[PDB]
């Protein structure tokens, strides 16, 4: 039923439905200046990794973002460390390196607008995009 349907379909078509489920939870959040992956995000990243291993043709781009006081260049560098941390986590779960690319956007594409710490927190993130 609903999100549990589709067991009758080919693997390719089951994967398209599964992509959509994964896009319901595809953001890793970070603390100020941090790029460590908290244990709170392990289960989600494991679901992404399992999908990627089962679908070798499907590629993911990890977008890194930042919203930290300092130069735009610093924000780009930190966004890269965030995206790379996710890539390394996925590779540690067996995903081929060639299925994962990373891009850092720094402060350039915020999720939330505003000049406050709450807004910043929603912006310090890495997003897994298919």
Pair of tokens at residue 23: 């896009």
Q: Which string of b and e fits 11-36 if b means at least 16 CB within 10 Å?
A: eeebbeebeeebeeebebebeeeebe
Contact yes or no for 93/46 (Cβ under 8 A): yes
Q: What is the DSSP string of 52-95?
A: HHH-TT--EEEEEE---SS-HHHHHHHHHHHHHHHHHHHHHTT-
Provide the total of helices (H) and of strands (E) in the chain, helices listed first.
Answer: 4, 4
CATH superfamily membership of 23-130: OmpA-like domain (3.30.1330.60)
* Interior angle at CA 127, CA 65 and CA 107, nearest 5: 15
**Method by which the model was determined:** X-ray
User: Cα(72)–Cα(77) distance, rounded to whole angstroms?
Assistant: 9
Whether the CB-CB separation of 54 and 97 falls below 8 Å is answered with: no
Q: List residues bridging with 104 in a β-sheet.
A: 64
Spatial contact of 68 and 33, defined as CB atoms under 8 Å apart: yes
**Total number of residues shown for the chain:** 130
Q: Is the dihedral of CA 75, 76, 81, 82 positive or negative?
A: positive
Torsional sign, CA 112, 30, 35, 114: positive
Q: What is d(CA 89, CA 80) in angstroms, rounded to the nearest whole number? A: 14
């Amino acid at each position: 039923n609903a999100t549990e349907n589709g067991s009758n379909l080919s693997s390719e078509e089951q994967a398209r439905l599964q992509m959509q489920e994964l896009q319901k939870n595809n953001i890793v959040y970070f603390g100020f200046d941090k790029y460590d992956i908290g244990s709170d995000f392990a289960q989600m990243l494991d679901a992404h990794a399992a999908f990627l291993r089962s679908n070798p043709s499907d590629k993911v781009v990890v977008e890194g973002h930042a919203d930290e006081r300092g130069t735009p260049e610093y924000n780009i560098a930190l966004g890269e460390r965030r995206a790379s941390a996710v890539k390394m986590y996925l590779q540690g779960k067996g995903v081929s390196a060639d299925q994962i690319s990373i891009v850092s956007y720094g402060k350039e594409k915020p999720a939330v607008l505003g000049h406050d710490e709450a807004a910043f927190a929603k912006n310090r993130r890495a997003v897994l995009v298919y």
